[PDB]
């Protein structure tokens, strides 16, 4: 029943990564370690959007990764991250991108599978194209993902009102058609 819902996956997370009973408010309280998670479901086609809100001053990266990726988002060729210090990450390369963000900020995460485009907004401000989906990643489902270092975030896949509704024909990830969505490979009993 856990994989049937759009939420963060208790079966696909670091040891210190904790998920609230809503499935959406997440934290990791280990001071010197990064702990990550992926959502229960992933996207294979379409233009979609989710939001994440920062609840404190801890470090975090948010974005998308495939099932082959490390939960340490952006440290391999299967993940894309945007981090609070104003850096995008992919294949262990951290580049200046966008703006810094922190407590009280909301990051919008845009994914256009059909055009192969990843981009982000901060409090409704378009930060620009962050990544193109590379040839090696084509035809592979992308799951919302984060990694935290002594931080707390809250996801919104579309089941609650968006603080900054998506532009340009992107729609809530939770409203993606059934045939364009893929269940996580990480499951169990609840």
Numbering used by the authors: 86 to 275
Quote from the publication.
The human RNA helicase DDX1 in the DEAD-box family plays an important role in RNA processing and has been associated with HIV-1 replication and tumour progression. DDX1 differs from all other DEAD-box proteins in a novel structural feature, a SPRY insertion domain in the helicase core. In DDX1, this DEAD-box core fold is disrupted by the large SPRY domain, prominently positioned in RecA-like domain 1 between the P-loop (Walker A) motif and conserved motif Ia, which separates the motifs by around 240 residues instead of the usual to 20–40 residues as in other DEAD-box proteins. SPRY domains are known to function as protein–protein interaction platforms.
The protein construct used in the final crystallization setup consisted of residues 72–283 of human DDX1; however, clear electron density was only observed for residues 86–275 of chain A and residues 86–279 of chain B. The residues at the N- and C-terminus that could not be modelled are likely to be disordered in the crystal since we observed some ambiguous density that could not be interpreted. The models for the polypeptide chains A and B have a Cα r.m.s. deviation of 0.256 Å for alignment of all 193 residues (an r.m.s. deviation of 1.239 Å for all atoms), indicating that they are almost identical. hDSPRY adopts a compact β-sandwich conformation. The β-sandwich fold is slightly twisted and forms a bowl-like platform. Two layers of concave β-sheets stack together and are referred to in the following as β-sheets 1 and 2, and a third small β-sheet covers one side of the β-sandwich. β-Sheet 1 is composed of eight strands (β16, β1, β4, β13, β7, β8, β9 and β10), β-sheet 2 is composed of six strands (β2, β3, β14, β6, β11 and β12) and the small β-sheet 3 consists of only two strands (β15 and β5).
